[PDB]
């Protein structure tokens, strides 16, 4: 991985040593060439995972996530380029640096071979992210969103640090391969029940699980565009990636300890989906859409079946590209009228016919139209959840109906009806804004033709 990491560490000197008129071109050119090199990880001709050293190693779970991270860096640079044009030079280079730093840590976070190394990297991402939301956010509420984001994570993460230390003080190591090949069944004593929650609540908060999710709609609604893109596409998947990795050493307590969290996800996802029907803020509607998709990911990981893992991995990558595409699209309006209210601007298909096509395709991905990989996830999670118990189809049936309503209601409200003709500042879509959407959508279409690449570990 040191050939994906070291060149990425060089985008930091390149950011600072480049000319004022070359920073945005140079960095965004080399970010693409770094996401090309990360494709080497996909050269997996065998059933043995790639182990590069004692530190890093790539699996079929950590490779899609690694690549999605590297590909997202150039996307976020282009997204952040028009709302930073009024800042002096050092602020732009300081913004570019915080985004690169978040790509370097995220790649190391998914490639780490030891839990303690995962934890530290998994905590370091708060710094660049807290700086982004707070320094470059727009409203006065960005200060309260940084606190909610920082201390939901930290409160959950202290018990995880405790539990990880107990694992090593007993097993001798935190290496993920060794803990896999030497795992011993846990007793059902009241101490291991707490060890289970200690190892899980950190990741269940980051998903977020229903109940403890109020940090996400606060963070999204106030972060700059690249703050929402990375949050909705990668940082939520730190929770999912962690739970998959550490749940191997927690058996058999997941057969009963998971009930409270399968129930909060299955019921919680209906509560969040139905919120999107009455949400007056467009950036808020998407953020609750994320909460209700991650609910299925939580539910499917808690049952540990080959299908459920397979559906969750596909839904992790699919949601990564889709939610990011939605946030970019909502930003495109926001960078014209500087209002997040969904009903303020209407009939935008009349003056942005092409941007209205991307809206439709993003919206169709969100409501999981076959054959997109958004459905494959939803469909394979449903299949596994049905086998787990047959009445989960009742709640997933409902959530599928609501998911259609708020997806199309989102499209019908903003793109149709009459134009809000007083908006004389609706400039034609930039070539930059359209490229940003094509870069989200083309990979999503390509991954549908080759789903094998995002089946995860079980398949």
């Amino acid at each position: 991985m040191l050939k994906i990491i070291l060149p990425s560490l060089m985008l930091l000197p390149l950011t600072w040593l480049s000319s004022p008129k070359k920073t945005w071109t140079n960095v965004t050119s080399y970010s693409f060439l770094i996401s090309l090199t990360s494709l080497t990880l996909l050269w997996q001709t065998d059933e043995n995972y790639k182990n590069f050293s004692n530190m890093f190693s790539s699996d079929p779970l950590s490779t899609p996530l690694i690549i999605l991270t590297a590909w997202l860096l150039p996307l976020m640079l282009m997204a952040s380029q028009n709302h930073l044009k009024k800042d002096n030079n050092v602020l732009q280079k300081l913004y570019i640096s915080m985004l690169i730093s978040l790509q370097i840590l995220l790649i190391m976070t998914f490639s780490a071979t030891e839990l303690i190394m995962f934890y530290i990297l998994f905590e370091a991402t708060l710094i660049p992210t807290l700086i982004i939301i707070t320094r470059w956010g727009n409203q006065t509420e960005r200060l309260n969103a940084g606190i909610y984001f920082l201390f939901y994570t930290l409160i959950g993460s202290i018990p995880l640090l405790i539990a990880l230390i107990l694992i090593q003080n007993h097993v001798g190591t935190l290496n993920l391969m060794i803990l896999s090949f030497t795992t011993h069944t846990l007793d059902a004593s009241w101490s291991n029940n707490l060890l289970w929650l200690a190892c899980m609540m950190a990741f269940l908060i980051k998903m977020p699980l229903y109940g403890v999710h109020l940090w996400l709609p606060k963070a999204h609604v106030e972060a700059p565009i690249a703050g929402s893109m990375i949050l909705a596409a990668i940082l939520l998947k730190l929770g999912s990636y962690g739970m998959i990795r550490i749940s191997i050493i927690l058996d058999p307590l997941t057969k009963y300890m998971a009930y409270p969290f399968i129930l909060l996800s299955l019921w919680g996802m209906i509560m969040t989906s139905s919120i999107c029907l009455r949400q007056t803020d467009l950036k808020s509607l998407i953020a609750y859409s994320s909460v209700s998709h991650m609910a299925l990911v939580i539910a499917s990981i808690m049952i540990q079946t080959p299908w459920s893992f397979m559906g969750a991995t596909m839904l992790m990558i699919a949601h990564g590209l889709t939610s990011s595409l939605l946030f970019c699209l909502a930003n495109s309006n926001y960078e014209r009228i500087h209002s997040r209210t969904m009903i303020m601007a209407r009939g935008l298909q009349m003056v942005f016919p092409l941007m209205a096509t991307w809206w439709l395709m993003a919206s169709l991905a969100n409501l999981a139209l076959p054959p997109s990989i958004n459905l494959m996830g939803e469909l394979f999670i449903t299949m596994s959840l049905f086998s787990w118990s047959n009445f989960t189809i009742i709640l997933m049936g409902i959530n599928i109906i609501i998911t259609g309503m708020y997806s199309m209601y989102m499209i019908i409200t903003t793109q149709r009806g009459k134009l809000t003709n007083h908006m004389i500042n609706l400039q034609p879509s930039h070539t930059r804004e359209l490229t940003l959407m094509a870069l989200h959508m083309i990979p999503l279409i390509l991954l549908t033709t080759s789903p094998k690449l995002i089946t995860g570990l079980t398949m």
Partner: protein
């Protein structure tokens, strides 16, 4: 015939000859407890380095 000792002669440290045996354990002390055995060998580098969490060297 008695001669008075000069100044300083009575305070001298003299040697006395006697056939009394020399005591060997005048304090009636027990045996001193054994020292902790020393560890023999030459230093070798620590196996696999510091062995500190995930650090390799």
């Amino acid at each position: 015939g008695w001669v008075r000792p000069d100044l300083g002669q009575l305070s001298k440290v003299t040697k006395v000859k006697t056939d009394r045996p020399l005591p060997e354990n005048p304090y009636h002390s027990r045996a001193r407890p054994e020292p902790n055995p020393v560890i023999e060998g030459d230093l070798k580098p620590a196996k696999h380095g510091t062995r500190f969490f995930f650090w390799t060297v």
